[PDB]
Point group: C2
Chain length 270, copies 2
């Protein structure tokens, strides 16, 4: 499963996460510090054309409409990550945990440089699937950062920033690979008992990641739990605590409805 | 002859850069029943290949690519509606050349066909104005009347007007459609080309104008315009339009912030 990407993918993605023309490092391929926002590494999901669904063989009675992306963990192993090239992704289940009539699956991936074999990204996605059966198995150990609950300490946030979400952001963001109609088609969305189309959880995650970098600098590890929906046109509020020399704990709040979109989350600074 | 392979992603990215939003899913969602492309999309072969820029620098002397300015553009869509995906093959043929002092005015033509059928999709006539250059004085082919029509704005007040904000970040998005010229994003190159800061692509202004016109008047299959003034990211456009027959909408594009004219001598031909 090979994915060839270039500066156009990088810039399209960076802009979707709020990169501006003031930040030429994000939007301009000839800038001396031209760079990709590291959450870009998850996009192998949409460019590893069939292989991505390899966890399904371990499931029974699997209905895709009943699947939820509950957690995501990403690591960058080669700093800084590349802004162009060719990467090969290997997918492997990490764990399956039967829970009543449902299953929690942890699905792992590793993306390497296709012309040297150098490890670039790794991802661990946690999926929650209703009305599904599976074996109770553990295929691999997980990094501490991936399973850390990252509870916000009982003090004031060291940082707070508001991030308006364009009413049209999902329309742009989906060009990075995820075409799910839930994020764009009102008929589909309302048909699915949503008030209107929702923003991609990974876009919320990225937006959060970008905002945190503007303040705290770059990170090579990120983990978060998805706890609530976000609508385009709404405003996100990122609350952040500096919890070690290494580690920024955060939450992403939705101002307009007084909910929480991202919780149990942190980044590890380079 | 360069082969251009494009898909829904290119179309939506282009359409969004021209101000298309989720209020108009026909421009921004590929599974919309009316999914379509704003037809200026057909010009992109002008900037998105190497044989599109080296194929005319062929009668050029002392050419600097950074000293290039786009002066007029004509586009015709021959196959309606324009495809939202496919493979297109383009042939470039010189139309005319002229020295004007130490600079050079060049009219360069192109025809774009489907790569699977040989069917004519788009025709383009670009007019370039290049600073600090030198060339022969020549004329190689005839031109459609619509391309050389001066389309003088009628003396009456416009039949229609609308303002179009230009995001400070729009050139960064627009250039992803193919024209990477650093003049539109890098202050160093913009000043190298004698502008105070990066300028918006002439073709983005052109396309923003086209999009506003379509919203009011419907689809067109033929467009021509003269570029007469710079536009900076962050400024506000004003499209002025005059209905000049059941067929033809004459327009100008003004810059509200500085009281200048960015596009003049311009019109579209409405589809049937």
């Amino acid at each position: 499963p090979v994915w060839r990407f270039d500066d156009r993918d990088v810039i399209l993605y960076n802009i979707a996460l709020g990169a501006t023309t003031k930040q030429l490092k994000y939007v301009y391929e000839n800038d001396s510090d031209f760079q990709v926002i590291p959450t870009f590494g998850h996009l192998i999901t949409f460019n590893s054309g069939k292989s991505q669904n390899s966890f399904a063989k371990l499931l029974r009675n699997f209905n895709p409409m009943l699947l939820l992306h509950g957690e995501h963990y990403l690591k960058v192993h080669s700093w800084p990550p590349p802004t162009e090239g060719e990467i090969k992704t290997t997918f492997e289940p990490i764990a399956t945990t039967p829970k009543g009539t449902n299953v929690v699956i942890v699905h792992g991936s590793k993306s390497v440089d296709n012309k040297s074999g150098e490890l670039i990204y790794s991802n661990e996605a946690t999926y929650f699937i209703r009305n599904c059966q599976a074996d109770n198995k553990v295929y691999a150990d997980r990094p501490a950062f991936a399973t850390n609950q990252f509870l916000a300490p009982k003090r004031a946030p060291d940082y707070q920033v508001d991030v308006p979400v364009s009413e049209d952001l999902a329309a742009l963001y989906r060009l990075s690979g995820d075409r799910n109609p839930l994020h764009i088609d009102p008929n589909f969305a309302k048909g699915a008992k949503f008030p209107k189309p929702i923003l991609h959880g990974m876009c919320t995650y990225g937006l959060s990641a970008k905002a945190l970098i503007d303040k705290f600098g770059m990170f090579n590890e990120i983990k978060a739990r998805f706890t609530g929906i976000v609508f385009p046109g709404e405003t996100l509020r990122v609350l952040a605590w500096k919890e070690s020399d290494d580690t920024i704990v955060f939450q992403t709040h939705v101002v307009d409805r007084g909910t929480i979109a991202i919780n149990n989350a942190a980044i590890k600074l380079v």
